[PDB]
Design a protein around this ligand. Structure first.
Ligand SMILES: *[C@@H]1O[C@H](CO)[C@@H](O[C@@H]2O[C@H](CO)[C@@H](O)[C@H](O)[C@H]2NC(C)=O)[C@H](O)[C@H]1NC(C)=O
Ligand SMILES: [Fe+3]
Length: 653
């Protein structure tokens, strides 16, 4: 008989400290952990929890749960605008003398935007304008949905300022900034088209309009009012050099309205707040008093539970009780469901990820609904086969658009299904694939590969890339050993003997000769049973940084570098879990976009959706828990992986 608050598992301890905050309300709250907020909504519907903080995007996810009976019973507002129904209203701001009497006439104007993927300055304008025949269509399927929007904007407006990361892929973003440079010509620094830019953001858009001869600005009321020194909410009038009489809101009417009056606004971003199941009603006043009290006492400096558990913020923690409202009706009255459901015209593009298990299917579906609610496009669809090979076949057949493959199966999958890598996992704090490296003791006499001829080697297991593939390819490639009888010949290069676990299962007896009492590469190196250890960079924790170095077999100069420099002192880059796609359908940009937008949106917000976390007590579902990001696969890395595999297929290994 408590009010159960769902909380991302990572923040359970913070919710517990919160439960110790003294308050006048004696309401008992309990912390219910979930995998993330998306799961929390399921637990709320299922009554394992009673409420959870939500952004409007989360309410939308919540409104789609089959048979849902959610209720938004609490709004988080600002102290500046405690009585405003919406977080912020989107407005169109023009010079008073702009000849215009219809929103069709926004065409050809120089436009001032807050920045890409933002609400009043981008998503809302796109949502509303696209309803207008004069606005370019966005269903050209030779390119991605994101490119369709940018093409549409750069074709409708004469010039714009739309800064920021248009693509999560750096090279795609740069290429797009070149091809649609008109979208950056109104900015303070057009070549860069990124933050900081004095002509971007809520205020910079009005400066773009007032000071850089822009002709329309998409922004929000509060920055429009303050730009002109006008009062807003609790904020009083301010001295301003800008004169509001020279400017006007442009209304959907096509009419103009004074800035000094109530703004005409085509949509608003709704406030965040709390969502709960319908049985929270009736039991509703005591909870609201409890949350209000926690909000007003965490205001002072702001413990973790303030933001991570209650979903408040420094700027947004005025708890306002509303007339309880269903989530979609909450979103509707802001015109914000339209924005959340924005598309690009039929057929809406879909990227179909192939998964190999029921749990992965369910993770892909929860990820899809989240991505969609968060304005990431293409829509993610989920397709299930019963193996990796069947997912790969399906990508070939165009039953799917992408599928993952691990370790050294990427080159095989390309030979066999004519697929190619699109993006791969990166790891560590440096967000980097693993590398196969060559570990040596400090001060030993090896600086290049021929110096190790006749010597002894330690390896990771024969079944590993770094242990077997990379040293075998590295030697064969430099012709230090013939490519007939490769494993034997490897043994003949390290003629002093080697430990390559599992080489047993031609005459390969030399390659287990040094395994001694303990075949681990770090014990084998430590005990001078080998003079170099071919291991993965992922295993370098087993080597004392003060005693061991990397042999930079990759560098022209050879030599040595520290354990942490593996990314440039190595044998080969290691294939990480990789998603592959066919040749004749979605572009690599269209395929990479949604997963890399997820990875980058969720890198700091695993509480919203735990993309790399445990999923129903299963690890490494879709992504490995160790993944720290996603990057597009360079063609040259692809091509190198194919050559390595070709050498290994030659050896019959
Ligand atoms: C949501 O969108 C509708 C359609 O643009 C807006 O409807 C207008 O509402 C005004 C009141 O400001 C009415 O007087 C007009 O008749 C409506 N105009 C049109 C063109 O339909 C409404 O303003 C929007 N609501 C929000 C909160 O953004
Ligand atoms: Fe915004």
């Amino acid at each position: 008989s408590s009010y159960k608050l769902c909380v991302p598992a990572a923040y359970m301890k913070d919710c517990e400290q919160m439960l110790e905050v003294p308050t006048k309300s004696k309401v008992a709250l309990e912390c219910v952990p979930a995998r993330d907020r998306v799961e929390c909504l399921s637990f709320v519907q299922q009554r394992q929890a009673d409420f959870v903080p939500v952004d409007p995007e989360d309410m939308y996810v919540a409104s789609k749960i089959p048979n849902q009976d959610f209720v938004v019973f609490q709004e988080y507002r600002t102290d500046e605008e405690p009585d405003a129904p919406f977080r912020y209203e989107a407005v169109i701001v023009v010079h008073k003398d702009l000849p215009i009497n219809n929103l069709d006439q926004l065409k050809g104007l120089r436009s001032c935007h807050t920045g890409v993927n933002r609400n009043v300055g981008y998503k809302i304008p796109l949502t509303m304008l696209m309803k207008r025949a004069v606005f370019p269509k966005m269903n050209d399927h030779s390119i991605s949905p994101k490119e369709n929007e940018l093409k549409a904007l750069s074709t409708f407006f004469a010039k714009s300022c739309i800064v920021g990361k248009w693509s999560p892929d750096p090279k795609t973003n740069s290429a797009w900034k070149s091809q649609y440079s008109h979208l950056c010509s109104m900015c303070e620094h057009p070549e860069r088209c990124d933050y900081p830019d004095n002509y971007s953001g809520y205020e910079g858009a009005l400066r773009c309009l007032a000071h850089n001869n822009g002709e329309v600005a998409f922004t929000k009321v509060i920055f429009t009012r303050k730009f002109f020194g006008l009062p807003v909410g609790t904020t009083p009038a301010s001295p301003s050099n800008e004169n509001p009489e020279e400017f006007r809101y442009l209304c959907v009417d096509g009419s103009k309205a004074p800035i000094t009056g109530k703004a005409c606004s085509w949509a608003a971003r709704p406030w965040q707040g709390l969502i709960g199941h319908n049985d929270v009603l009736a039991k509703l006043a005591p909870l609201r008093e409890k949350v209000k009290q926690l909000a007003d006492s965490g205001a002072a400096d702001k413990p973790e539970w303030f933001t991570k558990v209650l979903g408040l913020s420094e700027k947004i923690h005025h708890v306002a009780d509303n007339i309880p409202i269903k989530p979609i009706d909450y979103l509707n009255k802001a015109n914000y469901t339209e924005v959340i459901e924005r598309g690009h015209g039929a057929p809406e593009l879909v990227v179909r990820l192939c998964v190999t298990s029921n749990v992965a299917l369910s993770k892909c579906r929860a990820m899809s609904v989240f991505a969609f609610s968060r304005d990431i496009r293409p829509i993610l669809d989920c397709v299930q086969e019963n193996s990796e090979d069947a997912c790969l076949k399906s990508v070939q057949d165009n039953g799917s658009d992408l599928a993952s493959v691990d370790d050294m199966r990427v080159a095989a999958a390309a030979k066999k299904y004519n697929l190619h890598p699109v993006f791969h996992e990166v790891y560590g704090e440096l967000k980097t694939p693993n590398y196969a490296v060559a570990v040596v003791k400090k001060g030993t006499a090896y600086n290049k590969i021929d110096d190790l001829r006749g010597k002894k080697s330690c390896h990771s297991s024969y079944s590993t890339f770094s242990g077997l593939h990379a040293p075998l390819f590295y030697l064969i490639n430099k012709r230090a050993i013939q490519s007939d009888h490769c494993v034997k010949n490897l043994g003949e290069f390290f003629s002093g003997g080697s430990c390559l676990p599992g080489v047993d299962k031609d005459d390969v007896s030399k390659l287990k000769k040094q395994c001694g009492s303990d075949s681990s590469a770090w014990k084998c190196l430590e005990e001078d049973r080998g003079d170099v250890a071919f291991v993965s960079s992922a295993d370098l924790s087993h080597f004392d940084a003060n005693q061991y170095e990397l042999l930079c077999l990759n560098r022209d100069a050879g030599g040595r570098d520290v354990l942490s420099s593996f990314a440039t002192c190595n044998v080969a880059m290691a294939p990480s879990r990789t998603w592959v796609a066919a040749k004749d359908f979605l572009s690599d940009v269209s395929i990479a976009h949604t997963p890399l937008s997820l990875a980058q949106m969720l890198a700091t917000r695993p509480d919203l959706f735990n993309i790399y976390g445990e999923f129903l007590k299963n690890n490494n579902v879709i992504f490995n828990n160790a993944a720290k990001g996603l990057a597009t696969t360079e063609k040259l890395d692809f091509e190198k992986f194919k050559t390595i595999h070709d050498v290994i297929s030659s050896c019959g290994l």
